[PDB]
Structure 1
Amino acid sequence: GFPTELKPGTNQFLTTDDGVSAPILPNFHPTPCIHIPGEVRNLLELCQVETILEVNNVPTNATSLMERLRFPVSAQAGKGELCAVFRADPGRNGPWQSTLLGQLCGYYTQWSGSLEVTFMFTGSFMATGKMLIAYTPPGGPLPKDRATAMLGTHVIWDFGLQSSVTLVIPWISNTHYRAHARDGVFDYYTTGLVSIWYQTNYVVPIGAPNTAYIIALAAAQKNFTMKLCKDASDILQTGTIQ
């Protein structure tokens, strides 16, 4: 017959290979597809949806697991005190593991784009105050006071009729893409830090509670992309699933 030759790649089974295979049921026609609402074509649509960010991941008891979803605010002495700090790496361990964006980025090695964080104030109608939320680009240590924290990109938030404000973490990096960062050599890919400071105070009249809570929601922007699909770091199986 036709003379051929075999090359050093035969007889192997590559799991990511895409080819043709022999059908088992000939002349089989599947069931027609009716209209179903809510079809997803790309994962970035889900990556653009906000989810709750556990900034306050201190408690671990079963009864106190619901306390990780918010962090408090209260009246201070007026010195410009610090409220909370956290990192800006969605793929790293920490607060971002509670969002859908972090879980989806856990399957991809590299990412690129801008992020978005939204804080909602859940106090009484009679409470007022102002806050400073600052983002420190990589290379700078944890700010010691508000004077050093004001030198990065920041926003000043005033409580009022609109209960939420948004902080945008812009894309500032030397490389086009970032790999997943961790302690050691791979801390070359840090994104920076986010800090929350008191601007003036938390003022409240007579007859209203002295403590309120803040909910943080996180998502991605329209330039966010990922590549080089891999497997998730955590496997949810401790033995044989019977």
Structure 2
Amino acid sequence: FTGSFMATGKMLIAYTPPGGPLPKDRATAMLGTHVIWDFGLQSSVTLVIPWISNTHYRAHARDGVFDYYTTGLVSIWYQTNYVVPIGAPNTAYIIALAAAQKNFTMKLCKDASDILQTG
């Protein structure tokens, strides 16, 4: 969270495992895996996507891809409203950083790119 120091409030960050559909509302999202983030208390918070696996093979059009289906979803909800005092901006930004954990791996080299050396 990169808002003002004087700004406070709570956000509910939720992970819906694969198959599960985006929660209708905050209420139901709360019933699942989630984190109540108080950007008044801590400026950063980290969510862990327990597991993703791009292994299920597909053969759609005529081009055979190896796609996910393991699309877990991360939904962010306003738990409270954004609270600020006089003189503090009414809009703040959140920066999201991501990376794979140590148990991450990759198989089958596949050179592919749209960015190739020019003529």
> Considering the TM-score relative to the shorter chain, is it more than 0.5?
yes
1:152 positional shift:
2.5
Q: Aligned partners of 2:115, 2:35: CA distance in 1, in Å? A: 39
Could you report, residue by residue, the CA deviation over 1:94-114 in whole angstroms, capped at 9, with x for unpaired residues? xxxxxxxxxxxxxxxxxxxxx
1:187 positional shift:
5.7
1:192 positional shift:
1.5
CA contact (8 A) 1:131 1:198 kept: yes
1:162 positional shift:
3.4
Percent identity of the aligned residues?
100
Q: Aligned partners of 2:62, 2:37: CA distance in 1, in Å? A: 32
SS in 1 for 2:108: strand
Closer/same/farther in 2, CA of residues 186 and 229 from structure 1, 3 Å limit: closer
Q: Aligned partners of 1:221, 1:179: CA distance in 2, in Å? A: 30
Q: Aligned partners of 2:82, 2:32: CA distance in 1, in Å? A: 24
Could you report, residue by residue, the CA deviation over 1:29-64 in whole angstroms, capped at 9, with x for unpaired residues? xxxxxxxxxxxxxxxxxxxxxxxxxxxxxxxxxxxx
CA contact (8 A) 2:56 2:69 kept: no
Identify, as 1 or 2, the structure richer in strand: 1
1:232 aligns with 2:107: no
Extract unaligned runs of 5+ from structure 2: none
Aligned length: 119
Q: CA RMSD in A?
A: 4.0
Q: Aligned partners of 1:182, 1:170: CA distance in 2, in Å? A: 33
1:173 positional shift:
6.4
1:131 positional shift:
0.4
Q: Aligned partners of 2:54, 2:74: CA distance in 1, in Å? A: 20
Closer/same/farther in 2, CA of residues 193 and 161 from structure 1, 3 Å limit: closer
Closer/same/farther in 2, CA of residues 188 and 229 from structure 1, 3 Å limit: closer
Could you report, residue by residue, the CA deviation over 1:150-180 in whole angstroms, capped at 9, with x for unpaired residues? 2321111111353111001102669799999
Per the normalisation by structure 1, the TM-score is 0.41
Per the normalisation by structure 2, the TM-score is 0.78
SS in 2 for 1:147: helix
Q: Rg: which structure is higher?
A: 1
Q: Aligned partners of 1:167, 1:181: CA distance in 2, in Å? A: 36
Give the corresponding residue for 1:152: 32
1:213-232 to 2 correspondences below 5 Å: 213-232=93-112
Q: Aligned partners of 1:182, 1:122: CA distance in 2, in Å? A: 46
Identify, as 1 or 2, the structure richer in helix: 1
Query: Which one has more relative contact order, counting CA pairs under 8 Å at least 6 apart?
Result: 2
